[PDB]
Structure formats: C-alpha cells, structure tokens
Amino acid sequence: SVPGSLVVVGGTYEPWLPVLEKVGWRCTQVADLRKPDALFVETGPCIGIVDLSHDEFSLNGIANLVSSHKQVRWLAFIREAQLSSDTICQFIVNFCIDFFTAPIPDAQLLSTIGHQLGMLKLEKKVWPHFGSAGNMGLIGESMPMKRLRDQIKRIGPTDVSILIYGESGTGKETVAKAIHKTSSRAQKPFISVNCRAMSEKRLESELFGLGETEEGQQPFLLQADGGTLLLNDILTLPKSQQLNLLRFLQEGTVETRQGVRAVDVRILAANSSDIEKALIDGDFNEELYHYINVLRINVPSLKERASDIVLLAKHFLQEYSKEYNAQARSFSDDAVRGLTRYHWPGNVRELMNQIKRVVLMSDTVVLDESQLDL
Amino acid sequence: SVPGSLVVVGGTYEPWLPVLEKVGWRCTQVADLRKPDALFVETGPCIGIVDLSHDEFSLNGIANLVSSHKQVRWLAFIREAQLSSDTICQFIVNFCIDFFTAPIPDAQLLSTIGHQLGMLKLEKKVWPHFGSAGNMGLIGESMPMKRLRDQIKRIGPTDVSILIYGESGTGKETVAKAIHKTSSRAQKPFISVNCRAMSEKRLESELFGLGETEEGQQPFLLQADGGTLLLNDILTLPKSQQLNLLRFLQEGTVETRQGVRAVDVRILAANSSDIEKALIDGDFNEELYHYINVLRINVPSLKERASDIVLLAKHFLQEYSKEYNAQARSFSDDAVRGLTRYHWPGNVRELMNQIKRVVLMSDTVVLDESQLDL
Numbered sequence: 001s002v003p004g005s006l007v008v009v010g011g012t013y014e015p016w017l018p019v020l021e022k023v024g025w026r027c028t029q030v031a032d033l034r035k036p037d038a039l040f041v042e043t044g045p046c047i048g049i050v051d052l053s054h055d056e057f058s059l060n061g062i063a064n065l066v067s068s069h070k071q072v073r074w075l076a077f078i079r080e081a082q083l084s085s086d087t088i089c090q091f092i093v094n095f096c097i098d099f100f101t102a103p104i105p106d107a108q109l110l111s112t113i114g115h116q117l118g119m120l121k122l123e124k125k126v127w128p129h130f131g132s133a134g135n136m137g138l139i140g141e142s143m144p145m146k147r148l149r150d151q152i153k154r155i156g157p158t159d160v161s162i163l164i165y166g167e168s169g170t171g172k173e174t175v176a177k178a179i180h181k182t183s184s185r186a187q188k189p190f191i192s193v194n195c196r197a198m199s200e201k202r203l204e205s206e207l208f209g210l211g212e213t214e215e216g217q218q219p220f221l222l223q224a225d226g227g228t229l230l231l232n233d234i235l236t237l238p239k240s241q242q243l244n245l246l247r248f249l250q251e252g253t254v255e256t257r258q259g260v261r262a263v264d265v266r267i268l269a270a271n272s273s274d275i276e277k278a279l280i281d282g283d284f285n286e287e288l289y290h291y292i293n294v295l296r297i298n299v300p301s302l303k304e305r306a307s308d309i310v311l312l313a314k315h316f317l318q319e320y321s322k323e324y325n326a327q328a329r330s331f332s333d334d335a336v337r338g339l340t341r342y343h344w345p346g347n348v349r350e351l352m353n354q355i356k357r358v359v360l361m362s363d364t365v366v367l368d369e370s371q372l373d374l
Numbered sequence: 375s376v377p378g379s380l381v382v383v384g385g386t387y388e389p390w391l392p393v394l395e396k397v398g399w400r401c402t403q404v405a406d407l408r409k410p411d412a413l414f415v416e417t418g419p420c421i422g423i424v425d426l427s428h429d430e431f432s433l434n435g436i437a438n439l440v441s442s443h444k445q446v447r448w449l450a451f452i453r454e455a456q457l458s459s460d461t462i463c464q465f466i467v468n469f470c471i472d473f474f475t476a477p478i479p480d481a482q483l484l485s486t487i488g489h490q491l492g493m494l495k496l497e498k499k500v501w502p503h504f505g506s507a508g509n510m511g512l513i514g515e516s517m518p519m520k521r522l523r524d525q526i527k528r529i530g531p532t533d534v535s536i537l538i539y540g541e542s543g544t545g546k547e548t549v550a551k552a553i554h555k556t557s558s559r560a561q562k563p564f565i566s567v568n569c570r571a572m573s574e575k576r577l578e579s580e581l582f583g584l585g586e587t588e589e590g591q592q593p594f595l596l597q598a599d600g601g602t603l604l605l606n607d608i609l610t611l612p613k614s615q616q617l618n619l620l621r622f623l624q625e626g627t628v629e630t631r632q633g634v635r636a637v638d639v640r641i642l643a644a645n646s647s648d649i650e651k652a653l654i655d656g657d658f659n660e661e662l663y664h665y666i667n668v669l670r671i672n673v674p675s676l677k678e679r680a681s682d683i684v685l686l687a688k689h690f691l692q693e694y695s696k697e698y699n700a701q702a703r704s705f706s707d708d709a710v711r712g713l714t715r716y717h718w719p720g721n722v723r724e725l726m727n728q729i730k731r732v733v734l735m736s737d738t739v740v741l742d743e744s745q746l747d748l
C-alpha cells in the first residue's frame with residue numbers, strides 16, 4: 001500500500017514521521033511544489049500532510065495545489081508548530097479537518113490519522129487493481145484517460161448527481177453510460193435526452209402533461225424508475241422547465257396518464273457552455289445548480305489526449321470497415337502524424353464522423369494523405 | 375460553544391445520543407430533510423451527525439446539503455448500521471471524516487467526535503468575515519449583480535488564484551479590489567498590472583532583468599508581498615513572461631541584486647477576449663492556465679442588468695457634480711430611457727467616461743433631452 005505523503009523542504013520534522021513508520025506505513029515526502037502537482041493526481045486519493053511552520057513554501061500556491069482538481073482525489077492534512085497564525089489560518093476553509101500540534105501524542109496522533117487512513121482504506125479495498133482495463137475503458141487509454149477512469153470508479157456507485165462538463169463530442173453520453181454500470185442500478189433503464197431542441201412543448205409533456213397526453217405517453221422519468229436519466233446540454237433548458245426538473249429534484253414526482261406518482265431516479269447532467277457566465281447572467285437557476293454540481297468530472301479533450309488519438313483511429317476503422325464492407329484496413333504512416341495534429345473541435349465525434357466519410361470514398365487498402373484535409 | 379444537531383426518525387437512537395449533552399453540548403434532533411436547510415443556515419458551524427440506517431433520506435439530496443450551504447458551516451459526520459459491502463460505503467466520498475459503528479465505543483466514541491473541538495473551535499473564530507455590511511456591492515444592485523456579491527464573498531477567503539473575465543469595460547479590476555478586502559491578507563498591498571504596451575523591456579525588469587540599485591522601483595512582486603497582484607489582459611503575455619509567471623507560481627522567486635527574496639502573492643488575472651480561441655493557437659500555455667483558472671468569476675454585460683444603468687449614472691453624476699461643482703443635479707425622465715439605449719459596447723468604462731463629458735458640458739440643472747445627442 002502506497003498512500004500517505006507529506007510535502008515540505010524539511011522532512012526532518014520527524015517528531016511524528018517514524019511514529020507513522022514504526023507502526024508500519026512508511027512515507028513519501030516532497031520538497032518542491034511543482035512535483036507533488038504531478039504526484040497527487042496520479043496517486044489519486046491519499047492523505048497528504050502539508051507542514052507549515054512557515055517553512056519557506058508559499059500560501060497562495062498552497063491553497064492552489066489543494067483545489068486545482070485535487071479536491072475529491074485527495075483528503076487534505078496540515079502541520080505547524082504553535083504558530084497559531086491567526087491571519088491566513090483561513091486555509092482550513094479547505095477541510096484540512098485537523099491540524100498538527102507540537103505537544104504531539106506520538107501514538108494518539110495515530111488515532112486521528114489511522115481513522116483517516118482507515119477512511120481511505122475503504123475506497124481501494126473493494127477494488128485494489130482497477131486502473132488498466134475497466135471494461136476496456138469504453139474509449140481510450142492515455143494520461144488524462146487513465147485519470148478519468150480513476151475518478152469514474154470513485155464517483156460511480158454513490159447514487160448522487162454528477163455534472164459532466166466537457167467539450168462537444170467528448171462523450172458525455174459515453175461517460176454517463178460508464179458510471180451507470182458502477183451505480184449498482186446498472187440493469188435498470190438508461191435514458192439520454194438531447195435537450196437541445198426539446199422546445200418547451202414536449203419537454204413539458206414529459207413532466208406535467210399539458211393540453212395533450214395521447215394515451216400512455218409514459219414520462220421519460222416514468223420509464224427511468226429504478227435506473228438513471230441523463231440531460232445533455234442542460235444550459236439549453238428553458239426557465240419554466242428547470243423548475244419541473246427542480247420539482248422532481250425537490251419532491252421526486254412526475255405525472256403519468258394513470259395518475260401522478262413519485263419515483264426514485266439518479267439524474268445526471270451534461271454541460272457544454274461556460275457554466276460560470278450562465279449563472280451570473282441568470283440563464284440557469286443556481287439552486288438547481290448546487291444539486292447537480294455535487295461532484296464534478298472533467299472529460300478530457302483530444303487536445304489534451306496526445307498518445308491516444310492514434311488508438312481511436314485504429315479501432316474506429318474496425319467497426320466502420322466491418323459495417324460497410326470497405327477494402328481498407330490501415331492508414332499510411334504519414335496519415336498517423338496528420339491526425340495527431342488536427343485541432344479536433346468535435347474531438348472523438350469529429351474523428352469518428354470524418355473517418356466514416358473516408359471509408360466510403362477510398363479505393364485503396366491504405367489511407368493516404370491528401371483527400372481528407374478539410 | 376453550542377453545537378449539537380442530529381437528523382432522522384431515530385428518537386430511538388437513545389442507544390448513543392444522551393452521552394453528547396453530558397460532556398457539554400447543545401443537541402437538537404431533526405427528522406424532515408427540508409428543515410435542516412433552514413436550520414443549518416442559522417445554527418452556523420455546528421457538528422451534525424447524519425444517520426444512514428437506510429431509513430428514509432434520499433442520499434442524492436443528502437450529499438447536496440454537505441456541499442450546498444454547509445461547507446465550513448458544518449463539520450460532517452455520519453451514522454449507519456454496518457451497511458458496508460455496497461455503494462453506501464462509497465457514499466463517504468462526501469468528506470464525512472468518520473463513520474459511526476453501533477455497539478457504542480463510548481470511551482472511544484468521543485475520540486472520533488471530540489477530536490473536532492479544537493478544529494471547530496477555530497471555525498467559530500473566523501466566521502463573521504461578512505463585515506462592512508458588504509462593501510455596498512462596490513457597484514450596482516440588480517439581479518445579475520446580486521449574484522456577484524455572494525460569489526465574491528465566497529471565493530474571497532480561499533487564497534487561491536481567480537480568473538476574472540468579462541466584456542471590454544466591465545471593471546475586472548473593480549472585482550479584484552473586492553476579494554482583496556474580503557481576503558485574510560486584506561490590508562496588505564494590492565497591485566494591478568496593465569499591459570497594453572508593457573513590452574518585454576519593463577515587465578522582465580519587474581522580476582529580474584536590469585534594475586540594479588538599492589531601491590530601484592522594487593519588483594511589482596516584492597511590493598505585492600503578502601498582498602494581491604492582478605495582471606489585466608493576462609492572455610496577451612509573451613511565453614517568456616508566461617514562463618516567469620509559471621516559474622513563480624511553481625517556485626516563488628524573484629531576483630534583486632540587493633538580495634533575492636521570495637514573496638507571498640495571490641496572483642489573480644483579468645481577461646476580456648475569448649480565451650478558447652487563443653488556447654488552440656498554442657499562444658497561451660495550458661499548465662499556466664490551470665493555476666490561474668482555479669476559480670472563474672464572470673462579470674456581466676449591461677444588456678442583462680439593464681435595470682442598473684439608471685443607477686450607475688445617478689451615482690456617477692453625484693460623484694462628479696460635487697467634484698467639479700457642476701449645476702447638474704438630476705436627469706430628465708426621457709434622459710433615463712436613452713441611457714439604456716446607447717447599447718454601451720465599452721460597458722461601465724464607457725458610461726463613466728462619457729458622463730465625464732456631458733457633466734463638463736451641460737449648463738442646466740436638469741439634463742435636458744436635447745443634450746444626449748451623442
């Protein structure tokens with residue numbers, strides 16, 4: 001087991017270190033601050049002691065390293081010596097739940113840490129080897145994609161709502177399917193809604209049946225009883241519609257043809273636009289936002305996914321060549337470089353769609369360079 | 375000291391409750407999920423135990439309150455009847471520090487809870503950071519402006535870097551001065567950096583570069599020691615200065631021939647132009663963007679808070695009229711309409727400096743309709 005890692009140019013502050021080691025835990029300290037930034041991510045969830053007897057290293061960047069997407073993937077911990085530091089003690093606004101005194105009980109500080117160390121041992125115990133496969137990862141396998149799966153697993157099971165904000169065609173629907181399998185309600189229904197063009201009329205027929213409800217009609221939430229309902233591009237939700245989603249959020253009740261009935265649905269969302277501007281402006285209700293933004297997940301873009309662009313092309317060829325019986329089976333080597341350079345605004349989707357176009361053009365078995373430049 | 379708060383039908387949690395008012399704590403049990411919201415707001419930084427005997431509470435909404443309005447305003451704690459094996463065990467991703475068994479480890483029990491006294495006893499010390507009755511909002515007071523005060527006061531204390539983006543003359547720096555006053559550093563120096571024509575000469579002379587005296591200007595960083603530094607139009611920085619920003623954000627150094635020093639700088643940023651269009655261009659480094667975009671704060675356009683345009687002029691007249699002893703005292707009822715009509719591409723800076731004109735040009739006590747033909 002390799003969790004537990006303090007960070008300071010000191011490290012010689014061992015009136016508490018071998019006490020953690022002699023109990024059989026070891027330790028891994030950090031000096032500079034450019035290094036743990038790359039460590040805390042890869043390590044995922046761990047206990048990190050930030051020793052601050054002033055000790056030379058900052059306070060602004062100290063607050064940054066704690067929050068720079070290291071919130072959920074790190075349980076915070078701090079250390080100082082009598083140094084009450086009444087001023088910027090506001091650093092404990094970031095749930096550094098317990099400090100570290102100088103009259104240390106070199107055995108009962110283990111009572112605090114050990115309960116927190118035993119708190120982290122909860123997570124990895126029921127899955128101590130998931131990090132490679134994970135049912136193929138469902139898309140790719142890079143640095144931020146290995147990162148993505150590590151988050152997906154520790155945010156899956158908890159039947160809370162999750163905000164999925166990423167670029168267009170990053171696979172918000174793909175991610176929603178992924179965590180659904182881990183949500184223990186996997187078998188139960190899954191519903192994806194392209195809320196972009198719902199245009200109030202039918203979008204409200206789903207919840208409170210307006211001046212028409214054909215026969216069954218059966219609400220999108222009615223079918224999604226024991227399962228999961230997803231709403232993509234949630235910022236495209238009209239004002240009077242956000243309330244009804246907020247209604248089901250605050251009550252858990254939708255109207256069907258054979259009477260109004262309450263259900264229990266884990267509702268997920270998917271964001272495309274800048275979420276901050278939409279809130280200040282008042283496009284979207286912020287009280288509903290806090291319900292969805294319980295936990296955030298960033299779906300990596302292709303610009304952030306270098307050593308992985310190539311894999312997405314090899315396996316997309318397969319499903320598409322087999323589908324349409326094309327006489328091609330590989331790109332040329334120059335076509336490999338030509339794809340890892342493209343902006344990929346549509347990300348996976350554009351690489352997906354454009355490749356499908358190519359397949360239905362080429363007469364050759366190997367895909368050259370010139371034809372697909374646009 | 376007056377904390378105690380429980381929540382569930384478990385009045386039959388006599389198996390562990392009454393030992394909490396002895397030792398000396400003011401308990402208060404709740405039952406209905408909706409009331410603790412109104413309760414946990416006014417009670418403040420109390421410690422609340424949330425029972426999860428799988429009795430009633432929709433865990434999706436339970437995780438909400440943990441993050442909604444009760445972050446610092448509540449030290450989390452949970453109780454359950456050994457419901458491990460499944461996802462409920464993983465539901466302790468919501469930072470619930472400690473679990474609760476069932477066969478009361480009494481003499482050990484408090485070691486879980488009571489280790490939060492000295493921590494919670496702190497939270498009560500730095501709570502009334504509201505103060506100043508709110509700096510009059512510094513500017514206006516509409517709907518989209520009412521949003522800004524709260525978000526400013528929240529992201530204020532957290533000494534992290536914050537990205538401040540908006541339109542051309544929205545007053546990005548106007549916001550930077552605000553969280554500086556809600557900071558913990560607070561009184562410490564506030565420094566802003568404009569860079570329309572800063573070149574590479576003087577900006578690199580700020581950090582190191584030339585300047586080899588014993589009081590020669592002294593680095594914009596060194597003067598901002600312990601305070602706050604803002605870089606307006608941050609995205610136009612050349613790489614070699616983006617590096618210097620990233621160098622300082624990862625190390626924290628700046629050289630002076632009179633002796634190199636390290637400083638404590640909360641590096642905020644201000645942006646107007648579309649950031650994303652420049653990211654793909656490879657002009658701005660993404661690693662630096664991370665450190666800066668730790669927190670986003672959006673400044674609204676006039677189009678959406680047009681219900682404040684009538685107020686800005688009223689105060690911009692009041693401050694200018696007394697300043698230059700103008701005979702101007704009020705606007706015409708028709709003059710009000712036209713001010714909401716000039717669109718104002720340059721936002722507040724436009725409306726402010728354009729009033730400087732009319733005030734120093736108009737001769738009547740009431741600014742007539744014929745005046746605003748500009």
Ligand SMILES: Nc1nc2c(ncn2[C@@H]2O[C@@H]3COP(=O)(O)O[C@H]4[C@@H](O)[C@H](n5cnc6c(=O)[nH]c(N)nc65)O[C@@H]4COP(=O)(O)O[C@H]3[C@H]2O)c(=O)[nH]1
Nearest residue numbers: 541542543569570571646647718719720721723724727728
């Ligand atoms: N004194 C003065 N002259 C004006 C004004 N508006 C336009 N001009 C003149 O008209 C030229 C072309 O303007 P443009 O199409 O807007 O294209 C402009 C404009 O888009 C931009 N530019 C230069 N200064 C500014 C500025 O202060 N604000 C803005 N928003 N753009 C500027 O760069 C381009 C170059 O403008 P120039 O080299 O100056 O060449 C400008 C300028 O000589 C003004 O309000 N005051």
Ligand SMILES: Nc1nc2c(ncn2[C@@H]2O[C@@H]3COP(=O)(O)O[C@H]4[C@@H](O)[C@H](n5cnc6c(=O)[nH]c(N)nc65)O[C@@H]4COP(=O)(O)O[C@H]3[C@H]2O)c(=O)[nH]1
Nearest residue numbers: 542543716718719720721723724725726727728729731748
């Ligand atoms: N169409 C047009 N109008 C002109 C021109 N020159 C002066 N004006 C007008 O008369 C006002 C005077 O602008 P200013 O004295 O330069 O004071 C301006 C100027 O200092 C600056 N500015 C705005 N646009 C430009 C620009 O395009 N180029 C430059 N160099 N400065 C600009 O912002 C100030 C506010 O400009 P405004 O609100 O627009 O109001 C401007 C503008 O409406 C021109 O060449 N073309």
